[PDB]
Design a protein around this ligand. Structure first.
Ligand SMILES: CCCCC/C=C\C/C=C\CCCCCCCC(=O)O
Ligand SMILES: CCCCC/C=C\C/C=C\CCCCCCCC(=O)O
Ligand SMILES: CCCCC/C=C\C/C=C\CCCCCCCC(=O)O
Ligand SMILES: CCCCCCCCCCCCCCCC(=O)O
Ligand SMILES: CCCCCCCCCCCCCCCC(=O)O
Ligand SMILES: CCCCCCCCCCCCCCCC(=O)O
Ligand SMILES: CCCCCCCCCCCCCCCC(=O)O
Ligand SMILES: N[C@@H](Cc1c[nH]c2ccccc12)C(=O)O
Ligand SMILES: N[C@@H](Cc1c[nH]c2ccccc12)C(=O)O
Ligand SMILES: N[C@@H](Cc1c[nH]c2ccccc12)C(=O)O
Ligand SMILES: CCCCCCCC(=O)O
Ligand SMILES: CCCCCCCC(=O)O
Ligand SMILES: CCCCCCCC(=O)O
Ligand SMILES: CCCCCCCC(=O)O
Ligand SMILES: CCCCCCCC(=O)O
Lengths: 532, 581, 581
């Protein structure tokens, strides 16, 4: 059996080559485009050889061994990758896993300078395939964890925008608002997948699956528990593969999962028919973003089975995570108006209550009160979004950003300035995108997006660690990252800074961070005035 | 014991505040928004005071007394309410009941102005709380009998439309269709509640309960008669409270009733599962419009117990309204295809038959043929709906409305023109609403909606009566209102109105109006025309309607718009005056 | 008693005129628009006479006689229909039937020119009535079997598109997408109706009815068999009327059937509620395409009554087609994931099994293995669709079409070139329409559509037969036409066509054509290429196609358009003619 031949045939030549390009650009982010183009062609010709004759040389090797061997030939001979070549002394599995630390979440790369639209349209028509490879290359090397099947989807949307607008009357009026929209969606997609990987790889399979159970139970509340569980198992496989760089198997398995879902809408959701009529890449993307289904008509009494019953400890002790998973499933399918991190916070609270109360005498009188525990947990984010969005409906995004900017620079000023500017702007952006949504979607939007942004901070900071408290909030609890950051207090240990004499806001937001780093003990009134 | 604190606790702070806003908006319809806001906050703080110490001052007075006192202070001080302050000389219970005549079913209020969609969306985002308070306020003062818990539901749907649409690409394409459907729903809900109050308050508890029995037996035909009767009794308490202004008790009791129904759904209907998993406002609303359950499969013969048996009279004399209630329950649970007013008509026919035949020597030989009486009573509404729906399908709604305008202006030309236009437009909306259904659902939709619309006519007319025939059809019989109006013929004792030139003068404001707005203006003119020349034939009127239709199509595409309407309009007036003079 | 009067009153004047226009346009396809307008107005004036007085001259004649007389006046007098005058010597019923062969499935008519969108919007405003008649006329003459009630539906959607888009800022951006979607739906509707007529008229009542049982049982699987059969009976009456030209009765009966279905939806399907709330034309259309209901949850085992029972033969022998119809009904209601032609193939296999096994000593041992015969029958279309859809998803519609062109030109090269291009393009559109569905809906869509498109081939070929194998596949078995055509291997006995130079000389007007126009010109040449050298392989043919694409790219991006084509045309044909012989 030739694994490379198997995946080439499943995926077809064009998806194969693009996925292979993404795989090398995300691991070898400093190599030039033309180097990766030749590499892709070599791999693709090797693959076709293996389709013709699976016994041909190296065709029976694992994609894991083959990808690493290719990587190691580059990094061994070249000098730009001296650190990564240290992995190449290892055997599998240590060698593949050693590659992960060399994925650079903030690569030091020049900003893409943009030709004129008519120029780009000309280049687009002149060689469409080369135009799109260069798109895949520039994005992938800048977002080394970008979800690979979704990047294929983005490339498709990118091309369709050039197809449409390069025939426009005002080509720029058509193209530029599309590319800006496309760029915004992609940054969010990248940051979301980065948290999927971090949750699975750093916090473990159980955490990733609990999160998947909650979100899928919200999205498909009519689905039976066994069906939700099956979907969570497949997704775990897909994202383990993608997050460890096995992009061919990931894309291939994601295709199979989309097909399984579309062949079984009658057991999953009434909202899928239009998704399941689109071609593969759009189909998977649509399914990932489909609106919540309506609730079934036969929901059980949650308090009957999990709080008021007297044999809860006996059912829990027979199968602890199954029982907790049923609780999470029943709770999330009933509350599409909750954030996922809140449901998980609630499920964990329920879990601690059972561990505690089932040891005591008369556990039922102990655990019957767990719903009361939930009340302040539900209110604290409700109060936080309400507060901060009210400041947001007052102060515009730019202003709201400077608010958070000042707030977080006070909390952790040991953090490097560009990290603080970057995270604070994204924090502000959550206000922009979530505050005006329907209340049945406010908390899901606002708090789950904050988790995405804080993961960016945790990932940037784990590379160059500068704040013990950040390390603490980042690593102590996945679901409690947001409250841990909210509850951080003003730093008492950082020394002020000496005096140093519409792209403009970032230089402005730079100095405001450098101002708070200069006079840390001030409050907002003085900080507003110095920039005025 | 503090009622205000009790209702505050059952309802929650924001349901309390919204219901108090509704209650004062419906009784003091002319006071501006900002006065009511300051009045609601005062009540709310009073309520919390009573939540703390139920022995605090006034905290032990009944909500009935507190509302009247608060009303009367406002009415004795602020002017614009010197008639309502006459009520304030009276003690309870006369004081509260006296307020009812000052509920204005047609208040003279400025038309709601509409900013741009994106502008409305911005106002909605800037202060979503005040946005919705103004909504409650503007609706309640225009619909002083709007069912208060349903108004809270509409406010949620209204908030949902803005949250769903104010981030759309094309906000207006999203928001305007929803708001117009909501407006349709709201008007119908208002008019239905108005009939619930009028039937209970004007015709009596027994009339209200009988209607309730018929409708709930259709909807819950597997329910035991005793279960139907319990629901009918709780609904009577709920609507007595709402219709007399006790909106806090009304809302609290409606919530308890939805609770009871959901906890007892396996004794009531299988269609309730979805409703009973919903939040409270959605829950109650869902229950009120749930589809009819299926009939039992093991029913006896209705005729055996009520017609064929020879001792009907013995069972009737033991308990007359109970026996009539059982007949009505049996007939209605079997006939979801009958309008409620028809079923009530049949129960009344049966009652009259028993009262007459039970006095006879051989009663069974007198009442056994009662089904023969029923047959013409079923066929007349069947025929009426069939023929009018065929007309509606030929004309579309706007022209069906115009056919009804002429018909009703001829029947009762003494009625005011805006009331004639209002009522006739709604009668045509019955066509749009009900004719689309197959014949099984057609009659319940069409005849009960007709009844709802004729009640609107009766309420506006009772205030300013101008026609004896209208007063007669309105008051002689609740359930026979529709046939009585259906059988009114042309008034031949009507003096045609004298010509008024400005009445038939049109201006380019026509072209600058939305469809609805231009329609009403043409319809207003069409009623005035018929009033000026009542003996004008259908084809004479179609002739003037063609001339005008061309007239406005030409003068809206006219180089100079206003001068066209003036120039060609006088040629139309003269041409029509001569064609009908 | 006057048939023309009865249908006039049932249909109303507007439906009646439109249907008469369609009837004459479909039988007299070469007569100009204004002739038909005059003819319809005279027929319409006669019908109104008959409504007013059913004894008036000619009012008691049959529609057949009246229609055929009017037809025969034009044909025997106006030298345009010389052949059609032959029918006119006959009497009814032979005269009316004789007309059918002169229905031209591919009339020789210039393509419709399209004015500018704003010009069309103007014409539509100025005389909507004439605009719509011209639409009905041009479609009906080009599609002489278009289902007449559905063409009324399409005209209403056509009007709504103009009503909406002609008040749009960018009229063309709104309207051209809608017109393109209506055209694609319309072409599919026409081809579907042509198979309904061909299956009924050529293959008989029993074949049409069995197909109808299968499709309605899939769609209405809760309905009782008696209810399915009633629907099938009525549908047989409807389509017999439409397919033989009796459009007034067909439309009248179809509306009665839609009414019957909507009055009895609780005996038929839970999915009909929304369809049954629409106006008549939308209602009938909606019902025709409503989604399949859910199967009952209390079905018995089909195998028990039809396979495992040991006295199948006794029950079959008592009532053979009823027993086979029950089988089909049971199998089809359980298998919405099977095409109708597969279900019919399975029923025919079951029928052959009973005929063979019921003569055996132990019939049960013989027919109890019938499910083993079904397995390869199910597998082959599943396999064929899976593979072809993968090819489609790797090529897209245009390339898929071109691949099918090569395959089918090799299969039946005697078939004319415009026919091969028409049929191959439509076969590729089956990929676009059906391959996007999950596999549970893929087979019904793809294989029944494949059958629709092959009937197009069969219908054009029956007129001008050039291939015995096409005639064999078209006439051997209705339900097996698709496997028969799928299994056709390359014609190894075809004599290649000579070389014609200007068949392969392309000119500058290529770049001046729309997307569909260039493809068809390119595809016409690709067929002629395969006819020139039927031995070449797809890679050899892709090569000649490859540089040809470049040839049109550069020569259209050229200073003098025509010059590059003429110059580089010689070299292209030269190297291609060298590359292949
Ligand atoms: C908008 C909320 C932020 C996104 C959440 C990201 C990470 C959560 C971690 C676990 C994900 C595992 C299941 C993947 C489900 C895909 C749906 C989605 O795309 O969610
Ligand atoms: C289309 C139906 C017409 C509505 C009838 C309106 C008024 C009915 C009069 C008396 C009803 C009193 C009982 C209340 C039942 C509520 C059901 C409903 O919501 O009706
Ligand atoms: C996509 C499948 C198309 C197949 C239809 C074509 C031919 C069918 C032959 C038999 C006609 C009898 C059924 C008539 C009603 C079916 C409605 C429909 O089917 O519209
Ligand atoms: C402008 C080039 C094309 C971008 C438009 C589609 C981009 C899809 C992927 C989004 C990521 C964009 C890269 C941003 C660089 C960065 O944030 O570091
Ligand atoms: C400013 C425009 C927004 C208001 C839209 C109305 C919301 C629908 C609520 C329905 C209740 C009854 C409305 C009828 C009003 C009237 O007749 O004056
Ligand atoms: C782009 C041309 C639009 C013509 C009018 C659109 C309405 C579609 C009517 C569908 C009937 C079948 C149309 C196909 C006509 C043909 O094949 O020549
Ligand atoms: C009385 C005749 C049969 C009663 C109703 C049956 C409906 C259609 C009849 C045709 C029978 C076709 C069933 C088998 C299909 C086949 O073998 O072709
Ligand atoms: N995390 C922020 C709160 C916040 C920032 N941006 C937001 C956007 C929406 C809601 C809340 C927020 C804090 O520490 O308080
Ligand atoms: N009440 C009307 C009939 C009518 C008006 N609107 C309707 C809607 C549907 C059915 C009947 C009607 C009359 O008797 O003149
Ligand atoms: N009839 C074709 C198969 C085919 C053509 N178009 C299709 C679309 C979908 C599925 C199959 C097909 C063949 O056997 O050669
Ligand atoms: C899918 C297995 C996960 C168990 C869910 C428990 C929630 C948790 O406490 O994190
Ligand atoms: C020489 C073959 C290299 C295969 C690259 C596969 C990339 C991956 O999915 O890990
Ligand atoms: C519950 C009391 C209602 C009485 C029903 C009898 C109907 C009638 O004759 O009016
Ligand atoms: C000052 C207190 C007024 C009480 C308001 C209660 C409203 C009502 O339900 O009648
Ligand atoms: C002059 C008589 C013409 C009758 C038209 C009937 C059309 C059709 O055949 O249904």
């Amino acid at each position: 059996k030739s694994e490379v031949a198997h995946r080439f045939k499943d995926l077809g030549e064009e998806n194969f080559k693009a996925l292979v390009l993404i795989a090398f650009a995300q691991y070898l982010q400093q190599c030039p485009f033309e180097d990766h183009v030749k590499l892709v062609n070599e791999v693709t010709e090797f693959a076709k050889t293996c389709v013709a004759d699976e016994s041909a040389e190296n065709c029976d090797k694992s994609l894991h061994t083959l990808f690493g061997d290719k990587l190691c030939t580059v990094a061994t001979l070249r000098e730009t990758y001296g650190e990564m070549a240290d992995c190449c002394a290892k055997q599998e599995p240590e060698r593949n896993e050693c590659f992960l630390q060399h994925k650079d979440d903030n690569p030091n790369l020049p900003r893409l300078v943009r030709p004129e639209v008519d120029v780009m349209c000309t280049a687009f028509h002149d060689n469409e395939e080369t135009f799109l490879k260069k798109y895949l290359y520039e994005i992938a090397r800048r977002h080394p964890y970008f979800y690979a099947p979704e990047l294929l989807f983005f490339a498709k949307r990118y091309k369709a925008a050039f197809t449409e607008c390069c025939q426009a009357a005002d080509k720029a009026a058509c193209l530029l608002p599309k590319l800006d929209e496309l760029r915004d969606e992609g940054k969010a997609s990248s940051a979301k997948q980065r948290l999927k990987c971090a949750s699975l790889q750093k916090f473990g399979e159980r955490a990733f699956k609990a999160w998947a159970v909650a979100r899928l139970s919200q999205r498909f509340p009519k689905a039976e528990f066994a069906e939700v569980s099956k979907l969570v198992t497949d997704l775990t496989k897909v994202h383990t593969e993608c997050c460890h760089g096995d992009l061919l198997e990931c894309a291939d398995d994601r295709a199979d999962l989309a097909k399984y879902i579309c062949e079984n809408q009658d057991s999953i959701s009434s909202k899928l028919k239009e998704c399941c009529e689109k071609p593969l890449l759009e189909k998977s993307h649509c399914i990932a973003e489909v609106e919540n289904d309506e609730m079934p008509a036969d929901l059980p009494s949650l308090a009957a089975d999990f709080v008021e019953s007297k044999d809860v400890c006996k059912n829990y002790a027979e199968a602890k995570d199954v029982f907790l998973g049923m609780f999470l499933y029943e709770y999330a399918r009933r509350h599409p108006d909750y954030s996922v991190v809140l449901l998980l916070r609630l499920a964990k609270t329920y879990e601690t209550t059972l561990e505690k109360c089932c040891a005591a005498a008369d556990p039922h009188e102990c655990y019957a009160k767990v719903f009361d525990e939930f009340k302040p947990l539900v209110e604290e984010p409700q109060n936080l979004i309400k507060q901060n969005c009210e400041l947001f409906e007052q102060l515009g995004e730019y202003k709201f950003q400077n608010a958070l900017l000042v707030r977080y620079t006070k909390k952790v000023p040991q953090v490097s300035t560009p990290t603080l500017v970057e995270v604070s702007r994204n924090l502000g952006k959550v206000g922009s995108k979530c505050c005006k949504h329907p209340e049945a979607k406010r908390m899901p939007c606002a708090e789950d997006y904050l988790s995405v942004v804080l993961n960016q901070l945790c990932v940037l900071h784990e590379k160059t660690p500068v704040s013990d408290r950040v390390t603490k909030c980042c690593t102590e609890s996945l679901v409690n990252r947001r409250p841990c950051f909210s509850a951080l207090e003003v730093d008492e240990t950082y020394v002020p800074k000496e005096f140093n004499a519409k792209e403009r806001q970032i230089k402005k937001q730079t100095a405001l961070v450098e101002l708070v780093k200069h006079k840390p003990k001030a409050t907002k009134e003085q900080l507003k005035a110095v920039m005025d």
